[PDB]
Structures are given as C-alpha cells and as structure tokens.
Ligand binder design. Sequence first.
Ligand SMILES: CC(=O)N[C@H]1[C@H](O[C@H]2[C@@H](O)[C@@H](CO)O[C@@H](O[C@H]3[C@H](O)[C@@H](O)[C@H](O)O[C@@H]3CO)[C@@H]2O)O[C@H](CO)[C@@H](O)[C@@H]1O[C@@H]1O[C@H](CO)[C@H](O)[C@H](O)[C@H]1O
Ligand code: NA
Ligand code: NA
Ligand SMILES: [Zn+2]
Ligand SMILES: [Zn+2]
Length: 401
Amino acid sequence: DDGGVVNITYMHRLPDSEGMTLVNDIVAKWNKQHPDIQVKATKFDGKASDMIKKLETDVKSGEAPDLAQVGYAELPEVFTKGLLQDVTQYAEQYKNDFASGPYSLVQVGGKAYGLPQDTGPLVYFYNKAEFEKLGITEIPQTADEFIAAAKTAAAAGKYIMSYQPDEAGNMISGLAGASGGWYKVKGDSWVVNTETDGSKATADFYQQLLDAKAATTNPRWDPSFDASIKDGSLIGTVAAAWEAPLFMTSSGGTGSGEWQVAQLGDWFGNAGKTGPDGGSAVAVLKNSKHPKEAMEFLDWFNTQVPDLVSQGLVPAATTEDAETPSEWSTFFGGQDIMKEFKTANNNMGDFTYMPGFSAVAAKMNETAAKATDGSGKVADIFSDAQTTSVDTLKNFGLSVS
Ligand SMILES: CC(=O)N[C@H]1[C@H](O[C@H]2[C@@H](O)[C@@H](CO)O[C@@H](O[C@H]3[C@H](O)[C@@H](O)[C@H](O)O[C@@H]3CO)[C@@H]2O)O[C@H](CO)[C@@H](O)[C@@H]1O[C@@H]1O[C@H](CO)[C@H](O)[C@H](O)[C@H]1O
Ligand code: NA
Ligand code: NA
Ligand SMILES: [Zn+2]
Ligand SMILES: [Zn+2]
C-alpha cells in the first residue's frame, strides 16, 4: 500500500471570480476529511489556450500536476502527444456518477483518461425589456426573420448579436457543428470536411449581420465587450452556458432583472439542435504516481454540484440536480436558467474533435478577425479550417483520406 499521506496536485482553469465558491475552498473540505489524500489545487496563471502548452512542457520536465483540466476538444490532442495516463480501471468505478455522453468524451479507443466535469451547450442571452422597446415580441426563429430584427435594432444603435472573432474556434465551430461533425475516422485514415451545410448556413448568418453592421465585433475577452453590455448597446448574443456568471459580472449589473436565456433559434442550419462550445474533463497526466487517489478525489470534486454551478459550470455529474443560484435567477428576471441549460445540453449535437484542433481553432480566429472590417469573408473561416485540419493531422503523422 501507499504511505499514510498521498499528495495530489490539481491544476485547473476555473474562473474563481467574486461571488463564486473558490476551488480552494471546495478542496479544503476534502483535505479536512482526508489527511490520507492531500490535494493542492492551483489556478493556471495564463490564458486558456496556453494551459495545454504548459502541461506539455511540464510533463516533459517532470513538473506536471497529477490532475489537470483538459477540454473535451483538447483531449485527443494531449492524448496524441502522450501526456495522459490510462485510468480505465478507476474511471469504471465512477462511471455511474456521470452522464453517459460526457463520460464517453474522456475515452480514446475505449480507454479512459480522467473524468468529465462540465458541458458547454450554446444558448441565447437577451434583454427582454430592450427587445420589447424595439417591438421584437418573440425570439425570431428563422435566420431571415432574425436578420430583419437585427437590422431594426442596429438602426436604433442596439445589437441583438455579437460576432466574437477571438471565439470563432470554439463558438463558431460549435454552431456549425450542431448539425453535423467535421471529423471522422474511416479505418486507416481521417476524413475531414469543415464545409458542411451547417458551416455554410453559419457563415451566411454572420456574413449578413456583418454586412448590415448589425452585430458587435468586439473580441469577447476584451474590455470593449464588457463595455457594450454595461452601456446597454449589446442586448442579445449567443453564449456558452458556462458564461452566465461571467456575463453577469461583465454587465456591472446593467439590465439586471430583464435578461433571459432562450434556446438557439434555427439560425445556423442547426435544425433544432445546439452544439458544444468548450466543456471540460479533468485528466490524469502521464507520470502521476497516484492515479487511484487522484481519481478518488476527482470523483468527489466533480460531484460537488452546487459548488461547481457557482463557477458557472453545467455539471456532467448526475448525482443530484443542478439548481439555479438565487443571484442568477434575480439577474435573469426570475428565470430558472439552469433548466434552459439542461434542455440545451439534451439537444446538443455530438462532435468529434481531431487531434490538433488547437491549430484549427487558432486559424479560425485569425481568419474570423479578417471579416470584421470586410477584408475577409465569414465563409473563409471554414475553408481555412479545412486546410489547417488536414495539414495538422499530417503534421501529427496521421493519415488523411
Ligand atoms: C474552449 C475553451 O477552452 N474556452 C475557454 C476560453 O478560451 C479562449 C480564450 O482564452 C481566447 C482569448 O483570446 O483565446 C482562445 O484561444 C485562442 C487564442 O486567443 C489565440 O491567440 C490562438 O492563436 O488560438 C487559440 C485557440 O487555439 C481560447 O480558446 O477562455 C475562457 C475565458 O478564460 C474560458 O472560460 C473558456 O473555457 C471554459 O471555461 C469554463 C469556466 O469558466 C469551463 O471550464 C469550460 O469547460 C471551459 O471550456
Ligand atoms: Na482508407
Ligand atoms: Na483564408
Ligand atoms: Zn480519507
Ligand atoms: Zn497511490
């Protein structure tokens, strides 16, 4: 057996914002109960896309943590780079605590590499009061009706959509992906087609909005995005469900009591489905000496539903129902928004991510930015994604048909 005290490290990229139950306060509850398995949790200091790059460096140097947050979209990539540890025999014991979909997303070739933590269905946030002032009395359900409403809003200096060039690889991929995968293994080779009917419909929607100067073009993570919420100009947008508390904080309180969550309309060729934008597992890394206890702790951590919800997560756990915090329902006009998140999750399309998708997302963002001043077309996001996807697979030494 192990010695009396096993020490585990967990690196995460949860927000830990004001109002949230901090990861360290969650882990402190574990540590008090379990002197036998002590956990040191740290938040990655850096932007999200740099985390798996640090993990790569640290695995090689022998400085890696036992446990690390790894997006579902990132897992095939870090697996292919040899950064993970097969923990199938441990995952199997905790399987029943988690939804089957998310659980399948910690697997590669029927081997499990950690446990699922949250999901990222796309939804629509809007200020119902401001919609009413503009005469928009229903969420438009077709792209054409939405675009018409958006032009009405824009003429009034309001915007019912944002175009987020720094999120094209996550949000726009998810919107296009709602109606069909881009990546499939066909035996000895990958087959790539990022130019699906969904990609085309998604491009057309944003193109018409941008041409009409009827969507904001501020990068999501820039202060200019927050300012557009605070100043009342951005009154509607697609958002990943985990954005809720982030968006609330970014608003400064503007529109509190008037915001609502709706399912995505049929704006993206999505035909009643939504798609994933982020969502993460926590994986056990290659040279962790204590995979059993890492997974023991992880199962506990990933089933602390209310605490995870406080971080904005839509938990993968099925051990208890997630409930909308009182502060959130108050901001969102009394709405039980978690119910909308659950509906969205249940209507979210499956989407395989090729190993190396980080390069695809990088290219998507670069090309997306060209569309903001009309130097590029929105459709080029997807034609470039096609080429970068094929190139990246080949760079990994993988066969492409
Ligand atoms: C899918 C994901 O991990 N989303 C993150 C989100 O990540 C994007 C942002 O960091 C933007 C900032 O510009 O960068 C994007 O990466 C780009 C990068 O900007 C380019 O320079 C480079 O060339 O390409 C990359 C793409 O490879 C990131 O993708 O960041 C937000 C805010 O920090 C995160 O919240 C979000 O992750 C989700 O966080 C939730 C907690 O708030 C949950 O953990 C959820 O599961 C995560 O998916
Ligand atoms: Na073949
Ligand atoms: Na291009
Ligand atoms: Zn114990
Ligand atoms: Zn051990």
